[PDB]
Subunit: 505 residues, 4 copies
């Protein structure tokens, strides 16, 4: 008999786990418990801070919510107006010395006229081809060229996506992009070229909110805090080392054993196969493919430069910098960096030179957060990547050579992106149902490995819906039909459902 | 204060309401009650019997289930193996002296060769058009022609559907037919013609089950019996006469008032609007179109004739009979008609003449169930429709002139089919959200008026899902996404969910 | 017995008749003779002159030759280098205040951007339709819209062609435009728009040559002069009044009768039918359609204005002027108008004012030649057309209100354009075979009525090939296969053939 | 000074050369002369006879005339109605034990039904592809598959054309086949399959006429006989051994020298180059490809078998016989073989064995003419080809094993077919202009090497038109525009033209 017995055990306290925990707590029927090897919940949606006081998320994290349930839990966790800052979704592509507003193809009027000719000719070919197309594209690359034409594909989406996924576009599937037909909007693109028009895809109704304090990690600390503490085990005491699927028993690192009836596992599924000592499953999970994420943070002295402005996140297809995305993290919250009165010496200049004195000077400060991908097809020299990033900041005119850097941050995250390879679905259909038949719900960004439902809201809801399937026989819609949940407003499920209203009478 | 108060009131004890009640009963959370004006549950899924002992459903009723929950409840209600009979899904189209196996287009090799040429030529046009098509069809009629070509369309789907819907095919929408591309399988059709194939689309795979006793109606009597009797109110005592939406009160025939927090109404939504005395809603519901259904039943003396055989249901596009569909109802169960030793006189011969004797003679007996549609665009003379049907049976060679008729049956059902008109959705998206804002879930064949989710299993699950929305925040998939639920096996929701397992432990 | 007898008689000494005569003269086999009612040869390729010394062709006459034979005869007739002036084929379309270089669609960057957007959208539509086209266009109008798209059609080719043909574009055939597929060059059009580029379809190798003296009329006087004078009969003495097909006898106005074995008739085929007193042919030829041509000339004082420059001919789609084409005839040769020392009084200003002084002043002078069409669907007020043309010159900014007009010219030509109506070929293929059966070769712009082989070189060769068919059994390729002769340089037939070389030896 | 001087010299007295002779003789202008190394005119359109009295053409020779001029000369040469026999153009394809009427694809209803399905499926693919096609086929093979689909292509046109051309379909061009669109008549082909119908492409108005005596060779002997004898030189005395193009001198084998002004050469152009000792032209003409033709004749005892009947010529796609075509030559004329009264011994039985009796016996007799091709890509065993042919006749059921063979014939013609390779035109446009520059008109089947104008009538007119170009400046239409002359009735040029009529007056 194990030390502890619950109906439903949840492994992991990132968004997916916390989602399961929240729904279990709401339903208040089956017994449950949640464990995590980290003392601080949040997983990949956590936040670090440098010794100089600059915060960094695990890369650019912008919330877009497809679900009212997710909203409910965030509102409950951070109920005050001044718990949040609201920003428009402002983004650009760096290309040929220019900041080109998203969406890229609608804004190529910024490029030289000869580039415009190349871009439109390419898209004309794609339009005429789309007119007689009667097959869906098989790879990501085919999708891109059918959607954009050669010229435009080559300027942005092809080289950008290699820098992101650390595999060639030709190696990825394309179903994960949705059911929209791969064909260009020739008229829209040429109309903006003729008119000499730029138009970004944001405005007063395209916004996001970001926590006032603690970065993205502040959300999940606050959400976890609404759970009954005696049902959590966070830290070394909550680290899973063994999963005996046949016994329905989990062993923690300190020797604690937990018997369960149903298992919701949100750790990476390759890690779960190892913890299960299941050589068949280990074999299968090793066929999955993922990339690692290097997060680089740069803290900079000065009031925000005009060239930077209200920019939120930025894309970099070109090979004059190693990162694929930059985030002006200091724009998200004034508390992502020190106040202007805080004194800090200059660590280095952007040109790499190490400055005159050790004099601590005042602010204000601003902050850049960068992401570089790594995989077996794309190695990264960890010793030089910080310096290479900083030079990239100078090449892209984000920093002047003389800009003063007062803090740096670098951290490698092993599992960063679950890759939509051609082989992904074939491998998953061999893994997830096998786990299912042992009463294991493996779910999450790496729990079920599907990037298209891999955001904080998706993840949270994969946990919520797993519980709902376990308890109420609900359909796991986010897991099995990403196009369905991404194409609608999911308003039906709330943090207070009729069941709780009726019961409280 | 009302005579009775419940959390959830269900109006109607046809399949939809019984679905709602079964789910309420399983959850055993909020209090509830179900009412019906009829002492016998079942609605349009009920069964009548003639004084001579011939059973008739409300037209041809064949169950194809898309849901495990539905199967669960049927198994619970009729658990013995000999509660059911299994049959292959055998259907034909009557065309030009021929019984043509479904699907019609795959079996036109039974038609004269000159007409096969016309058909194939037409379908060749349709295939060539579909290759360059860049729009969806807008009407039922365009869908038919794109799928079949002109010639095949003119032989079956066009004239048949007018005889069913009692509106032209040009006046209906086609979204209700699902998302498959409107395009011909030219190779399948020509292959069968060239090979002279007459192959029906049924086998050991394609089966249905039918109750051993009581007709389709026996299913719903059995399901209803699993409900706690004291929470039911069936008969004149259960007739709703008034719905006060603003006070959330219902008033019955005898004067009983019932307060509710949430209402699930499965009566026809135009009757609901009148019962609400809501003038705006009355106006909107009068804009919905529907056809009435006449059910004619004929009991015949004799062992099953060879020409009839294992036939189950039959379509009639042609002009020599008033019915659109016939069912060999005596094939569905040997208890649908009297035993061989039962003695009955002959009422008439099929050509209308008087029998040589009025004495009672023994059987065996077989039985025919027919359907005739009625609408404002298509009157039906009640006084002659029985005789016209019987003449139809001679014209179609289902009966010889000499066949002895020992029982007849006719009944008119006012609300028969909810019509998928072009206007339907425009009207419905104004009705249902208004009822929704008053905590009224109007659901069912005429509760929500959508034929594509209008079968017994669909209806039952509309009730089930309305309750799941009310109590557990579930998405109403069957109501809002017909294509979704019809295109998959719906296995997650069971009559025993985790919720009940965990509680009983 | 008649007054004269020849093997081959040619009626008419325009380009077609002179072609017949040159070939007969070269062959020097059968006896022949040519007649015309005008003392001066040349027909519609003749030239008039005002009392003030301004020459005018019958509207814009620019030579492009498809034949080395035609070249030989022109070179023979005007053998000196200073008999000719060479120019680039410079043309523009007047549209919304602008002179738009031909071809129009390649130069719409000069229009407002909003209008460019509509043009390009229309041509995108046309390109996509062209990609799946499987039928030929049936009308001139369909051909135009399939080539340009709606927007560009409406700006130029639709309204311009009504002003030319004096019939709607929907009433004309399009086979006459040749075998090229009706499809747009979308890339060419969008490329020039994107580059803000203008580009005419002329250059150092896209030229024409014009006669130094006497205008186009000089060519045919010179050609005629190479014939044996006693085989010609020009003037009132050469006017044909009657043609007796059955006796093969022509009667002239002074009563002279001519016997022939074969007849080459280049008069308008509807005049020929009347001359034949053939009521059937009269009926048939009356079914043909043609428009009349008003030629208006304006002599202007002053050196060539900068705004005019090297412009040769000009198209006018718009409703602010009555002419469809303008020619800067003073650019074709310095001898088309008086020398600068010549003194002329000013007749009126361009705005209609009297001049300040009626004294004769010197030049230099320049000169504009205009064309206005007339038909039963488009009447022309003969009394006001000159003043209307001059007002039109101000509206289009060719003349300033102050410009001094010193000479005017107006002549109406009954048969100007033979119209490629839908009915043309149906009619012609009854007329020409009946004439052929009578040994009558009816050939020429109105002799055989096909505009696509209606230029000077075509006409000339129609007469040559008619002779060659009569004598040597040659195919009449220009007559029957316009696309053939227009699509190649016809080099085989020369003014000196092998027959004449071997003969002299 | 040479031994003889003429204006025009004609080398060769096959149909091309004789065409040039006949036209020069008609024109009666320049002096001329025609030479041939054979005493008997006709070239590849001549006829051999066996010692047993069986005639054989050089393979199947059936005349279809595109030209009135050709008809005139044939009529002149053989003016009596008993000089000719008329037959319907009856042909079949031998396929899977059956004689299938031409055209093959309209008659596949004769094949097994499963095979018909495969044929129709293939042609459906081809129809759907043709509907969106916007490129022209580049190879013979590509053309075939687009016209017929894969199934039908593999049954006949692909294997047949390899047996004919002795090169793969993938290595030949397809322009030579005309301008018709490469697309299937799906409706026609499926209609005949559905109706179970066969239909040949012959009847009362689809006939050919054949000479009563002397085989096809009798035409050209007779046509030659109408020429002035003194202007001809046929035999060893007329064999050309040297051409000196710079001297315009030809030397014959007996050392006679002829000077010319213009040369019409109808010998194979690769032989012409050698005779010119022009190393450059030799190099180029060696780039042309051609196949050799083996003619085999078999004379058979007995009246014409029922299985043979009215069959004229036959196609053999399959591997069980080496020949690609067979002609029932005894059907073309009763005088193509001995009369019944003629006594001949049996040489062998069709199974290859010795006859029972060696005694001469009577007829009647019939006769089969076979064609086998050969090239560097398809070698033929010359030593066994007769026996292999006769076994092929047994394999195809044209001959019974017991049939008695009374005469055999075999002859190899080195230059049999000028092959339409992909390279043909690139080479010819290097050859023909270079010869033209030297006043050499190289014309005819191997004179100018274009199979699409390589029949007797084409050849004859290539000679006629070359002369017409030389003397009257005519366009060489047959040479340069095969589609033009083949797509019309060429009626303008007659054996008596206007020139001769007017001269006789």
């Amino acid at each position: 008999h194990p030390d502890i017995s619950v109906d439903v055990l949840v492994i992991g306290a990132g968004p997916t786990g916390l989602g399961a925990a929240k729904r279990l707590n709401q339903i208040d029927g089956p017994s449950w418990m949640i464990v995590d090897s980290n003392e601080t919940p949040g997983g990949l949606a956590s936040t670090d801070v440098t010794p100089e006081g600059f915060l960094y998320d695990v890369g650019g994290h912008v919330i877009f919510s497809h679900y009212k349930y997710f909203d409910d839990c965030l509102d409950e966790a951070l109920p005050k107006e001044d718990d949040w800052y609201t920003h428009q979704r402002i983004s650009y592509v760096r290309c040929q010395g220019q900041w080109v507003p998203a969406p890229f193809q609608n804004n190529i009027s910024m490029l030289p006229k000869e580039e415009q000719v190349k871009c439109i000719d390419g898209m004309i070919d794609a339009a005429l081809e789309a007119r007689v197309a009667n097959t869906k594209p098989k790879t990501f690359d085919e999708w891109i060229v059918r959607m954009m034409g050669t010229g435009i594909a080559d300027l942005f989406m092809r080289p950008y996506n290699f820098k992101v996924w650390a595999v060639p576009t030709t190696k990825m599937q394309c179903a994960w992009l949705g059911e929209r037909v791969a064909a260009p909007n020739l008229k829209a693109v040429t109309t903006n070229v003729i008119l000499g028009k730029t138009a970004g895809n944001w405005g007063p109704n395209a916004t996001f909110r970001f926590p006032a304090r603690g970065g993205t990690g502040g959300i999940w600390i606050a959400v976890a805090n609404t759970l009954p503490k005696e049902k959590t085990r966070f830290g070394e005491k909550g680290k899973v080392t063994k999963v005996n699927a046949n016994n329905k028993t989990v062993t923690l690192q300190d020797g604690t054993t937990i018997g369960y009836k149903k298992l919701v596992s949100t750790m990476a599924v390759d890690f779960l196969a190892e913890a299960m000592n299941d050589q068949e499953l280990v074999g299968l999970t090793k066929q999955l493919f993922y990339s690692s994420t290097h997060v680089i943070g740069v803290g900079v002295r000065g009031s925000r430069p005009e060239r930077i402005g209200d920019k939120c996140w930025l894309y970099f297809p070109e090979d004059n910098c190693p990162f694929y995305r930059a985030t002006i993290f200091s724009n998200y919250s004034p508390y992502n960096q020190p106040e202007a009165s805080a004194a800090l010496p200059t660590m280095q200049l952007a040109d790499g030179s190490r400055p005159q004195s050790t004099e601590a000077k005042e602010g204000p400060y601003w902050s850049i957060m960068l992401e570089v991908s790594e995989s077996s097809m794309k190695p990264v020299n960890q010793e030089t990547i910080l310096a290479d990033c900083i030079q990239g900041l100078v090449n892209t005119e984000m920093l002047k050579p003389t800009d003063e850097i007062v803090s740096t941050y670098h951290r490698r995250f092993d599992h960063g992106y679950p890759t939509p390879t051609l082989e992904r679905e074939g491998t998953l259909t061999q893994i997830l149902p096998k786990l299912q038949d042992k009463d294991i719900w493996s779910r999450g960004r790496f729990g079920s490995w599907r990037y298209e439902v891999g955001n904080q809201d998706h993840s949270f809801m994969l946990g919520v819906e797993a519980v709902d399937n376990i308890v109420n026989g609900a359909v796991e819609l986010t897991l099995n039909y990403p196009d369905f949940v991404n194409g609608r407003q999911n308003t039906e499920r709330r943090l207070v459902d009729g069941a709780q209203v009726f019961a409280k009478s």
